[PDB]
């Protein structure tokens, strides 16, 4: 059977705490007033829910209403007491309250508002500055949740909002997050295609905080190279293939021969074998203004196959990229 892992910080977060901060389960929500929210506009839908932008009439001020849908139920406790934990962290979106929906009969979060600019439009525009300058404040919100015995697990372009104006940056949708137990097996149909990590791809469940650090790693690589999506799998067998065409296949076996992990055997015909690739081998004229030996450096440090042996948030926010970055 495959080889037990554990993070390497943070490990015994949860086991100090009393029983209350991670047995969600037994979690009762404090409910607000439904009527203090008038929904304005339908902004979305998500596989788990409805998101509305919304108007606190005790206020005025605008808020965003994510309605849950009937969802796998008790993820709702999770998604609520996690939120709870990390409120009032850095960069950590606020949960403003929760009332009881009346049409939908399910609980309905409420936000504190982000004047967020779709990140196609926005990964076309920002400069080498202001990619690091965002780059460390999403590692502060990393940093704080993992400190907090929290993995994110859907880290991706989509629920980072920006409001570039005012250069502020929220963490949000929590609702694929968990605590972090060491030796605690995890479901690995989690985070979007693009951004799952290795580890989700060989189907390893003994997992963690790491997993963030490779989704925030792809971003990097789209954002510094001018590629979205930077690994651009057809389902999730080519997303390992498109991995392996980068990282090799040799340090790929490596990677679940350290953990005794077999692979599914359908990649037999689809692997093929790869050399690991030079990361310049991805510059070009047109993202070279992106491009630094300590971007690339930092990357290298982040996008490793073995979760183990990746950056982890705070190291992250001490790597030379960070240097230009004013603090």
């Not at 607000?32 to 009439?57: H, P």
């Not at 697990?153 to 949708?173: A, G, S, W």
């Not at 991995?243 to 015909?269: C, H, M, Q, S, W």
């Not at 630094?292 to 979760?307: G, I, M, Q, T, V």
Request: aromatic share 12%; with cysteine.
């Amino acid at each position: 059977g495959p080889v037990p892992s554990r993070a390497r910080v943070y490990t015994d977060v949860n086991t100090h705490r009393p029983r209350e901060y991670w047995d969600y389960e037994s979690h009762v929500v404090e409910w607000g007033n439904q009527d203090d929210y008038q929904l304005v506009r339908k902004l979305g839908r998500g596989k788990y829910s409805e998101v509305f932008e919304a108007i606190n009439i005790t206020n005025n001020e605008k808020v965003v209403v994510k309605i849950l849908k009937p969802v796998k139920k008790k993820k709702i406790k999770r998604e609520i007491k996690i939120l709870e934990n990390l409120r009032g962290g850095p960069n950590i979106i606020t949960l403003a309250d929760i009332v009881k929906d009346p049409v939908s009969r399910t609980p309905a979060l409420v936000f504190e508002h982000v004047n967020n600019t779709d990140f196609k439009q926005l990964y076309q525009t920002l400069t080498d500055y202001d990619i690091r300058f965002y780059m460390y404040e999403i590692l502060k919100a990393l940093d704080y949740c993992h400190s907090m015995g929290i993995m994110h697990r859907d880290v991706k372009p989509h629920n980072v909002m920006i409001d570039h104006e005012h250069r502020k940056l929220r963490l949000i949708d929590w609702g694929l997050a968990e605590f972090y137990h060491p030796g605690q097996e995890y479901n690995v149909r989690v985070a979007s295609r693009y951004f799952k990590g290795p580890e989700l791809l060989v189907d390893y469940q003994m997992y963690d905080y790491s997993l963030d650090m490779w989704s925030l790693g792809c971003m990097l690589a789209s954002m510094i190279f001018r590629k979205e999506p930077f690994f651009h799998g057809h389902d999730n067998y080519d997303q390992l293939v498109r991995i392996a065409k980068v990282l090799g296949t040799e340090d790929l076996y490596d990677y679940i021969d350290k953990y005794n992990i077999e692979l599914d055997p359908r990649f037999n015909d689809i692997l093929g074998r790869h050399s690991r690739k030079r990361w310049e081998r991805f510059v070009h004229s047109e993202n070279q203004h992106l491009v630094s030996p300590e971007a690339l450096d930092f990357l290298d440090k982040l996008l490793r196959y073995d979760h183990q042996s990746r950056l982890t948030a705070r190291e992250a926010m001490e790597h030379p990229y960070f240097y230009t970055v004013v603090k």
